[PDB]
C-alpha cells in the first residue's frame, strides 16, 4: 500500500535538459529526497517508450519526423526541435506508461511521475512546450484494464491535447479547470465545450479568470468532482497537477498556493481509486518544487517542516527559505455569479451522463 515513485538518475538528467525549465526535474527530486519522502515510497526506474508505445497516440509520420530532427508538426515558435528531443520524448512517455503499468499490476494505488503531464501535444503536432503527450499515453495503457478513466487537469492551461484525444469516447471523462481569456493559450475549453459525438457530455471544462485563490478554487473543484464522480463513477484517475497556477509563476494568472491544490488532491485520493499523478507546467522552478514536494507530503499523509532542508539547490529558495508560498496582491476577477452559472451548466451537462 505504498505509492510508486518513478525515478532514476538517467530519467532526471534527461528531463533536466529542457531549455525552458532547466534542471526543474532535479530541483523537484532533490527537494523531495531532502525531505526524505523517497524513503516512504517505492522507487521505480522508468522504461523508455518504444515507437509502438508512443504510436498508441502519435502518428508514425510525426514520430518519424521527431526522431529525424532529433538526429512543421508544430515544431517551432513555442516548440523548437532541439537535438535529442526524441530521446527526451520517449523517456517521458515511457515513464508515464511505467507508472500506468504499475497501477495495472496492483503494485500500488498511487504512482507518481512528476516530470510527465505534457498535456497539450496532439497526435501529430507539438504544442505548448509539449512534444509528446505522455498523459494520453498513460490513459491508453490504463485503458487496457479500466473501463472508465477520469482525467483531471489542474494545470493553468486548458488540457486540450488530452481532451481532443478522447472527445469522441465515453470511456474516459476529461475535466479541466483553467484560465479562459481572449488570446490566452490555447484559446479553447469554454464551459460549452462538452466533447463530440458519442463522447458528448464526457468533456468537462471550467473557465476561470485571473487572480483566483485557494478557497474559491477548492469550492469550485470539489463541487465539480463531486458531480463527476457521482455521474461517471471512474475506475481510475489520471491527475495532472501543473504548477503554473501557483502565485509568482511567470504565467502570472492565478493566485494559488500548494495548500489549495493540496485540498483538491486529498479529495481525489479519498476515492481510493488507482491514481496516476503527473506534473506539467510550473515555470517558477523553486516554487514548482515547493508545490510538488508539498503534494508528495499530502500523498504520504505527512506534515513537512516549513524550513527548506539543506540540499543541492538550497540557495534557490531565498530570501525566506521556507516551503510555503504567499499569495500575491492581485485582484480576483472571478465574479461569484459567473462561477455559479458555470457550475450550473456543468451540473446540467452531467445529468446526461449515465
Amino acid at each position: 500500500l505504498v505509492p510508486v515513485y518513478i525515478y532514476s538518475p538517467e530519467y532526471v538528467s534527461m528531463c533536466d535538459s529542457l531549455a525552458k525549465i532547466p534542471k526543474r526535474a532535479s530541483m523537484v527530486h532533490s527537494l523531495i529526497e531532502a525531505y526524505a519522502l523517497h524513503k516512504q515510497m517505492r522507487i521505480v526506474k522508468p522504461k523508455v517508450a518504444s515507437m509502438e508505445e508512443m504510436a498508441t497516440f502519435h502518428t508514425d509520420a510525426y514520430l518519424q519526423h521527431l526522431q529525424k530532427v532529433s538526429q512543421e508538426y508544430g515544431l517551432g515558435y513555442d516548440c523548437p526541435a532541439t537535438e535529442g528531443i526524441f530521446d527526451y520524448a520517449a523517456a517521458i512517455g515511457g515513464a508515464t506508461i511505467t507508472a500506468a503499468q504499475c497501477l495495472i499490476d496492483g503494485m500500488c494505488k498511487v504512482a507518481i511521475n512528476w516530470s510527465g503531464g505534457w498535456h497539450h501535444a496532439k497526435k501529430d503536432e507539438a504544442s505548448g512546450f509539449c512534444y509528446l503527450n505522455d498523459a494520453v499515453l498513460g490513459i491508453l495503457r490504463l485503458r487496457r484494464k479500466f473501463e472508465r478513466i477520469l482525467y483531471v487537469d489542474l494545470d493553468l492551461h486548458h488540457g486540450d491535447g488530452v481532451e481532443d484525444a478522447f472527445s469522441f469516447t465515453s470511456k474516459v471523462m476529461t475535466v479541466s479547470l483553467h484560465k479562459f481569456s481572449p488570446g490566452f493559450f490555447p484559446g479553447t475549453g469554454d464551459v460549452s465545450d462538452v466533447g463530440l459525438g458519442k463522447g458528448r457530455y464526457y468533456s468537462v471544462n471550467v473557465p476561470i479568470q485571473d487572480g483566483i485563490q485557494d478557497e474559491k478554487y477548492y469550492q469550485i473543484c470539489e463541487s465539480v468532482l463531486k458531480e463527476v464522480y457521482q455521474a461517471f463513477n471512474p475506475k481510475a484517475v489520471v491527475l495532472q497537477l501543473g504548477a503554473d497556477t501557483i502565485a509568482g509563476d511567470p504565467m502570472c494568472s492565478f493566485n494559488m498556493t500548494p495548500v489549495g491544490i493540496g485540498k483538491c488532491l486529498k479529495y481525489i485520493l479519498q476515492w481510493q481509486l488507482a491514481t496516476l499523478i503527473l506534473g506539467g507546467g510550473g515555470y517558477n522552478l523553486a516554487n514548482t518544487a515547493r508545490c510538488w514536494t508539498y503534494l508528495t507530503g499530502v500523498i504520504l499523509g505527512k506534515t513537512l517542516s516549513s524550513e527548506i532542508p539543506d540540499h543541492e539547490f538550497f540557495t534557490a529558495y531565498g530570501p525566506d527559505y521556507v516551503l510555503e508560498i504567499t499569495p500575491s496582491c492581485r485582484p480576483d476577477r472571478n465574479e461569484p455569479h459567473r462561477i455559479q452559472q458555470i457550475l450550473n451548466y456543468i451540473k446540467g451537462n452531467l445529468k446526461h451522463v449515465v
Binding site: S127, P186, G187
Partner: peptide, 5 residues
C-alpha cells in the same frame, strides 16, 4: 504557451 508564451 502557441508562441514563446
Amino acid at each position: 504557451x502557441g508562441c514563446c508564451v
